[PDB]
Structure formats: structure tokens, C-alpha cells
Amino acid sequence: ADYQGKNVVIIGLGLTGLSCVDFFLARGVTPRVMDTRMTPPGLDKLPEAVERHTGSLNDEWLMAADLIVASPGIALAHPSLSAAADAGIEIVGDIELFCREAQAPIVAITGSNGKSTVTTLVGEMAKAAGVNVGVGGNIGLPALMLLDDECELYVLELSSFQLETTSSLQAVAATILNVTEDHMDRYPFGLQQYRAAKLRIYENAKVCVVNADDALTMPIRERCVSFGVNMGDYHLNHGETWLRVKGEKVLNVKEMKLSGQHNYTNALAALALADAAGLPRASSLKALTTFTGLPHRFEVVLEHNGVRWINDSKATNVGSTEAALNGLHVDGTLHLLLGGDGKSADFSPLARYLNGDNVRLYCFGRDGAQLAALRPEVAEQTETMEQAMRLLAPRVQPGDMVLLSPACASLDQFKNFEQRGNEFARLAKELGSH
Ligand SMILES: N#Cc1ccc(COc2ccc3cc(S(=O)(=O)N[C@H](CCC(=O)O)C(=O)O)ccc3c2)c(F)c1
User: Fold this and answer.
1) Which residues are part of a known binding site for ATP?
2) CATH of the domain at 244
3) Do 143 and 281 share a domain, yes or no?
4) Full domain range(s) for residue 2
5) Residue span of the signal peptide, if any?
6) CA-CA distance, 134 to 131, in Å (whole number)?
7) Domain count of the chain?
8) Would you please indicate which residues are annotated as catalytic (active-site) residues?
9) What's the CATH code of the domain at 34?
10) Which of 113, 204, 285, 419 has the fewest CB atoms within 10 Å around its CB?
11) Nearest CA owner, ligand 1 atom 21
């Protein structure tokens, strides 16, 4: 692609928007930037020569554009964007721009749960092979900050929103890890529309990797490689669990630092991707044994006085909290923090994990009331996570677990789930010691 001379408008600042701004400038193009927020993140970092419009979308700017670059945070269904599309104005996102420039194979990963873990795992596999890899996308660095002629492989986490605006990805290996209800605030045609967005990832992919246990990850119409628990090209053989490929044992999971069936299927998906990308097995399997987990993803931030305080702030949907609760061992009482922006999710599937005598709920943020409703008898509701932590802290006994696994976005009260996890860890440290 060639952008010289074009009228380019970027919709949405934050970090993604900023990376787009730099992309265009380096290429001799001064874009304009708009954001529906009066004061968006990154504004103070915007180059002074860049024209900006905040507090709404500017239709004069949109309808004048040769190219619109939409942040994943704005819906293509927004009436102004819909209008520009109707006019035949080209709309892309940061990932589209990256793909048109990228000169190394791309491993592309999406899914409702596990995508950041799998993305990071594949990155560590490439690093163990001595491959110069750039890892990011919807996790870590925005994709455009990774772009480098010296890069030998790219491993990108791609959200459903990023995928909606991308058409030029031809991944060496692509996966949808799973599809569970999420982002319903952005998909008014429901779960299948959300699935359709993720299914785009397989288009022109050299190898597709599907979850044998989730039919929604499969292309609607060679086959795909698959992973799964009891079935799959990559599967588990099971007081001991092994990773297997076509019936052959490849790793006893006692060698991994991650635990739980969820993380073992993540290991399988990552190995399938690594394999398809042509990475050596030895180094891929080595990476599985060294990887410690991501911050905010079922992270023990404090284990003190017989109490484990776990930061699972990255659980921003129901399937993610289910993953934390399913098979969870707690010696005494589970003090479970739920809340924030539920994105119109149905929280009911959580109820079956919440029976019996040793569960307490502390529900906060926008949808705290809806979460308390799961089992009002063991539930407290507060406005903030800090209030819930101060409420629960005195009730904590040796043997208890305090788990932030909110099943919601943090965006009603926090900058992002990382700020939420960091605040929880701060409070855990204060409240979990005498
Ligand atoms: N123009 C314009 C914009 C752009 C962005 C925003 C607000 O930013 C948002 C909203 C929602 C949203 C959702 C996502 S996401 O769906 O990919 N990830 C969130 C992460 C939530 C969290 O960090 O807690 C999720 O999974 O719910 C990423 C960025 C996001 C940015 C505007 F107002 C106006």
C-alpha cells in the first residue's frame, strides 16, 4: 500500500491510536485524529502538528477522508462510520496496516479466553529457538510498534474488534481458541455475529488450528489442525497428565509451571501453532517448562498467614471466571470479587460454581447488583473494589482464598484490567498483613 498524499483520519487515540499516528508520520503523511471522548488517553502525547477533534466524531473530516483508521474501541456500526462505509470510504484498523507492511510470517491468535497466554507462550517458544520474534497486538505493544525488517516472526493477539477491520492477514498459523459470550455490548446480532468476527482470522491462513471441544471455533464451511482434552491432533493423556501429538507423548505437565486443564489446552494450542510456524520442538517444549504466567492471570500476589490473594483481573468475561472456578480447590472460604462493566453478559453460568457453605461474593462497579443476584444470600454489594476489599479483609481466615476474578471489564472505574489488578495487589498487601 501507498498512503502519500491521502487524507487520513484516525478514530480513537489511546495507545493504538498513537501508534497509528507515528506510522503515518514516518511515512510522510500527517493524519487527523478524532475521538468521541473529550479527553482521550494519549492526547498530551499527540504531536503538536497533528490536527485533532475531540468529544464527538467530525463528519466533515470523515466524509473528506481517503482512508479511515478505526480504533478497535469504536464500533463499525457507529452511524458516522456506517455512513462513511456506505460512501465507499475505505476503513481499516492498525492490524490491517501492520499486515500490509509485515515481512515475516504471522502467527495469529484470538478467542474469548486464553489468547494472551497462548500468544505469550508462542513468543517464548520462538525465543527459545533463537528466533528474533515480535510479540504483541491486543497484548503488550500495539502491532505497529513491532514492525521491523529484522523481525523473523510475529506473534499477535488479535481481538474480535481488530479482526473486523482486517482483510490482508494471511497467517502462517491462526487459531480461535474458544468462543464464549463476550462483547455483547458491541454485537447486537449476538453470539454468532461475535463468532463471525473471529472466524475472519482463518481467511488465507496457511494452517488453521481449532478447538475440538468448541464447535464455534471451526470454520463454518484441507481440514484444520485441532487440539482438545480427550480428542484432537493435540490432546491430553491422563494422577498425571501428558501433552500428546497424534498419540505420541511430548510432555509430562509436571514439568510446566502452569497448572490446570485450561493451561494444558493452552499449551497444546501454542504447540500446534509453533509447529505450524516451523519452530523446533525441543525449544518449544523447553519454553513450556520455563513460562511462569502473565500478570493479572490467576496471579498469586500474596500468600501470607494461611491466605492466598489471587489477582485474576484479566478475567473480563464469564468463561474466564468459569476457568478460574472450575475445579478450584479452596481449604476454607472463597471470598470472590465480582464486578465492573458486564458488557450485557448473562452471568447465570457462574451460579453452578457458587453453591454450598464456603463461598462469599463481593460485588461492585456498574453491574454489581446483577452479580449479587447470583446468590444474594452469600453476597455483599459495594460501589468500588476498594470498598469490597476493606469489607472482606476482616472476614478472611487462615485457609481462605481471596479471588479477584470479576467476569467483567474494568473500564467503568479503571483505565484497564491491569490498573484494576495492580490496585487489588496494592490492597492485598495492605490488608493481608497485621
Ligand atoms: N473514538 C473513539 C473511542 C475509542 C475508544 C473509546 C473507549 O475505549 C474502549 C472501550 C472498550 C474497549 C474494549 C476493548 S476490548 O474489548 O478489546 N478489551 C476489553 C478490556 C477490558 C479491560 O481492560 O478491563 C474487554 O475485553 O472487555 C479494548 C479497548 C476498548 C476501548 C471511546 F470511548 C471512544
Assistant:
1) 111-117
2) 3.40.1190.10
3) yes
4) 1-92
5) none
6) 9
7) 3
8) 115, 138, 183
9) 3.40.50.720
10) 204
11) 409
Domain-ending residue, one of 293, 312, 338 = 293
Cell of residue 304, nine digits: 501470607
DSSP 231: S
Question: What residues contact 68, with CB distance under 8 A and at least 6 apart?
Answer: 8, 9, 11, 62, 81, 84, 89, 90, 91, 92
Cell match 444474594: residue? 376
Method of determination is X-ray
Q: How far is the CA of 314 from the centre of ligand 1 (A)?
A: 14
User: What ligand 1 atom has the least distance to the C-alpha of 17?
Assistant: 4
Q: Report the pocket of ligand 1 as residue ranges, CB < 6 Å.
A: 11-12, 35-37, 71-74, 159, 161, 183, 316, 409-411, 416-417
| CA nearest to 1, candidates 67, 64, 50 | 67
Nearest CA to 258 out of 155, 154, 124, 354 is that of: 124
Q: Are residues 268 and 198 in the same domain?
A: yes
Contact of 28 with 4, CB cutoff 8 Å = yes
434 within domain boundaries: no
> Which residue, 293, 328, 351, sits at the end of a domain?
293
Query: Among 411, 412, 414, which residue has the most ligand 1 atoms within 8 Å of its CB, making it the best to mutate?
Result: 411
Among protein residues, the one whose CA lies closest to atom 6 of ligand 1: 73
